[PDB]
Amino acid sequence: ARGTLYIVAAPSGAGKSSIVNATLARDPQIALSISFTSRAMRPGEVNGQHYHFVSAEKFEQMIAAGDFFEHAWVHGDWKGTARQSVEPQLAAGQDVLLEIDWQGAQQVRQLVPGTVTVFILPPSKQALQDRMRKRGQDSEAVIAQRLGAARDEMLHFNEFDYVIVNEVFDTAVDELCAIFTASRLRREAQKVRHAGLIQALLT
Amino acid sequence: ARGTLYIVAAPSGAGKSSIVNATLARDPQIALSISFTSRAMRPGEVNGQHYHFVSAEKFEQMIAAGDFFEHAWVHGDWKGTARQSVEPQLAAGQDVLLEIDWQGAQQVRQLVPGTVTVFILPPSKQALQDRSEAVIAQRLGAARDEMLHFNEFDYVIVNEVFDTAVDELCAIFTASRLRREAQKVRHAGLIQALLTPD
Ligand SMILES: Nc1nc2c(ncn2[C@@H]2O[C@H](COP(=O)(O)OP(=O)(O)O)[C@@H](O)[C@H]2O)c(=O)[nH]1
Ligand SMILES: Nc1ncnc2c1ncn2[C@@H]1O[C@H](COP(=O)(O)OP(=O)(O)O)[C@@H](O)[C@H]1O
Numbered sequence: 548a549r550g551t552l553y554i555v556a557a558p559s560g561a562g563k564s565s566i567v568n569a570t571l572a573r574d575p576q577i578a579l580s581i582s583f584t585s586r587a588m589r590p591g592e593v594n595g596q597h598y599h600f601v602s603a604e605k606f607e608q609m610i611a612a613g614d615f616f617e618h619a620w621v622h623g624d625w626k627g628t629a630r631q632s633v634e635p636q637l638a639a640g641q642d643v644l645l646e647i648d649w650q651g652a653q654q655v656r657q658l659v660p661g662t663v664t665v666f667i668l669p670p671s672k673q674a675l676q677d678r679m680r681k682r683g684q685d686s687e688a689v690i691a692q693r694l695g696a697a698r699d700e701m702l703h704f705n706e707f708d709y710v711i712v713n714e715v716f717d718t719a720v721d722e723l724c725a726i727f728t729a730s731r732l733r734r735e736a737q738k739v740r741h742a743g744l745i746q747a748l749l750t
Numbered sequence: 751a752r753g754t755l756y757i758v759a760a761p762s763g764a765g766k767s768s769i770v771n772a773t774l775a776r777d778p779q780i781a782l783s784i785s786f787t788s789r790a791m792r793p794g795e796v797n798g799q800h801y802h803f804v805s806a807e808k809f810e811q812m813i814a815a816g817d818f819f820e821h822a823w824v825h826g827d828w829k830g831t832a833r834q835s836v837e838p839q840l841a842a843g844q845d846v847l848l849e850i851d852w853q854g855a856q857q858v859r860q861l862v863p864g865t866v867t868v869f870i871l872p873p874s875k876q877a878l879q880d881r882s883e884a885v886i887a888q889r890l891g892a893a894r895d896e897m898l899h900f901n902e903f904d905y906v907i908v909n910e911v912f913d914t915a916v917d918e919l920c921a922i923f924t925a926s927r928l929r930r931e932a933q934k935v936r937h938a939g940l941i942q943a944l945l946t947p948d
């Protein structure tokens with residue numbers, strides 16, 4: 548039986564990376580996908596861990612070769628999910644979580660129906676920019692650019708099945724765990740999981 | 751924000767009552783609905799505890815008056831959920847859980863936006879038969895007949911480990927409140943603020 552595809556989206560600084568890492572730590576049957584990008588590395592990022600960093604020319608070569616399940620132009624740079632990160636794992640029964648923008652999520656919904664998509668919101672407009680300040684060493688000029696990019700991302704929240712407002716971190720983790728647990732209890736997933744038991748009960 | 755309508759259905763002997771009771775103890779935002787029935791009270795029964803017991807004439811009067819949100823002929827007696835048991839709590843923001851049969855579950859799915867329906871299965875056929883040989887055969891047959899409608903429900907829980915079954919039902923309640931359309935109402939002002947420029 549094929550694995551389930553999960554998408555968690557949020558503007559940067561809403562805390563999706565930290566919530567997802569705590570959730571997958573608690574729910575290890577979902578594997579995290581490492582995206583490719585052509586944007587430059589930020590301090591604290593490690594190539595091969597947080598992203599597969601490539602040049603813009605290399606990313607575009609990979610586009611032409613069909614290497615990407617989805618890809619999109621995000622904040623002036625390429626971001627993308629390689630086919631090797633999704634299609635083989637889903638066919639092998641591995642659940643996969645993608646952390647992508649709304650453009651990539653729209654492409655994925657067209658390719659894989661049944662994807663479970665979640666959007667994470669900050670608890671206030673001020674809380675968003677406060678979290679950007681605490682995280683990086685970004686100049687106030689960069690922070691202003693990211694906030695404008697954050698509103699652009701949040702304008703597409705309505706495309707997602709679930710919405711989490713990340714006020715209390717531990718609560719947001721519980722709530723994402725609840726969504727992942729609930730998705731395994733959906734009728735069609737349980738029919739596969741318990742085909743023999745159900746066959747026995749109804750005969 | 752309006753409350754959610756939840757339906758938990760199961761054949762007898764799946765352990766549904768204990769799972770629902772344990773969930774309500776953990777989640778005080780969930781009100782349990784007391785159904786009306788025309789079945790005769792058995793000795794020792796308390797009206798208003800498990801059911802609102804009425805006469806067959808009174809139940810049918812209530813059917814005629816449109817008093818029932820859903821109602822059905824269940825195992826030879828009338829069963830139904832009155833609107834006064836759900837509509838006020840739903841409007842006040844309290845979630846309401848219904849313990850009804852599949853006939854009632856079908857009616858509610860048609861009526862109310864957001865209704866979440868959950869079907870609970872026993873972990874094996876032998877586990878059910880453990881929970882008059884002709885009466886036992888009748889009871890298993892009513893159990894099989896109810897399980898034939900599991901495919902009409904949004905979620906399925908197999909009650910193998912009790913504590914896991916309660917967690918899973920709680921997870922379903924939590925997840926349902928995070929659905930987009932509920933959260934847009936709940937955080938309407940927040941979303942307007944986040945999407946408005948400087
Ligand atoms: N449609 C409907 N079915 C109900 C309602 N209340 C209970 N039932 C169903 O009636 C069946 C018998 O209920 P139960 O209390 O276990 O048995 P009883 O004590 O002999 O009536 C179960 O399958 C319940 O799901 C109700 O309000 N509406
Ligand atoms: N609920 C929260 N309350 C306060 N700070 C939070 C909360 N969630 C995350 N943070 C912090 O906000 C910043 C955003 O971190 P991160 O998860 O990487 O955000 P994103 O991946 O959305 O860019 C981090 O400094 C993180 O520790």
Ligand SMILES: Nc1nc2c(ncn2[C@@H]2O[C@H](COP(=O)(O)O)[C@@H](O)[C@H]2O)c(=O)[nH]1
Pocket residue numbers: 556557558559582583586617618619621622626627628646647648650651652700
């Ligand atoms: N389309 C797409 N967007 C991605 C991918 N990986 C990360 N993103 C998104 O790009 C945005 C910017 O991330 P950042 O540049 O801050 O790491 C975030 O919304 C993030 O989720 C990917 O593989 N595809």
